Amino acid sequence: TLRVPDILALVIFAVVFLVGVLGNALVVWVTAFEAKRTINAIWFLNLAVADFLSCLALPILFTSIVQHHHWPFGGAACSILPSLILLNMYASILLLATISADRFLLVFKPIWCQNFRGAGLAWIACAVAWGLALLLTIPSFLYRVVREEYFPPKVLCGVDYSHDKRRERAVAIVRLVLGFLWPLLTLTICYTFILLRTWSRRATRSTKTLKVVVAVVASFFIFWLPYQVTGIMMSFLEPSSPTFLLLKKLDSLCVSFAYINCCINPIIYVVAGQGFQGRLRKS
């Protein structure tokens, strides 16, 4: 049957899918009309579409969980689908970091911004983020193969980094660094400096910037920790060890927990998005 650790991941996936069907669709609908007329919508449009494509692939994960990791598709899909999923996730994270970088640039340098702003830089930053996401994706697109058993054929998509080599620590370290340690530092430093500068003079204090900064940073750090720690633990472990079985059992729950951040991200743009209650009717 299915063990207890897994079970919660099923309802987590269902809830995330239900929330993500709505949300990002409304965000992209309301931000489509704000193109070529508002510079402060391109970042949110890109983030929303990346999250939408990220959330639209959930039923494949649901079926794979249900059917005891059965892969009838073939060699082509096994080396295509995970690459696209990872590309979407990494693009979302990098866009989340570059938005904070842009906010810092606006806060600490307004005169330069007022003279050299406009469409032409946001579209370049988004392209750079997507390119870095694809570059991070590449190894998954390269080193993915398939295997099956003779009599009880359990065909499944899996990784096999060459016949025998230790060229995996470098890949794992690069992925961990560029996916968790750089965006976290960027967010923390930028938001700390913005909070320090804003609360100095009057007519700038709002008691809301602290709320949004906490709601962003705490959620990010809480939700993307188990994924990275379990991944780096499994990357360095041999296929036959006691802890490997437990990590493999908890991997699906870790991924289901990770997707909650992408589920939640569109909610803040509606809750704290200035006055956003009748723009749907206006559109």
């Binding site: 494949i60 998509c157 899996g158 980094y161 016949h163 296929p239 991924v255």
Partner: peptide, 10 residues
């Protein structure tokens, strides 16, 4: 002895 199963999500 070099195959490691991996869920699709990862």
């Amino acid at each position: 002895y070099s195959f490691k199963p991996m869920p699709l999500x990862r």
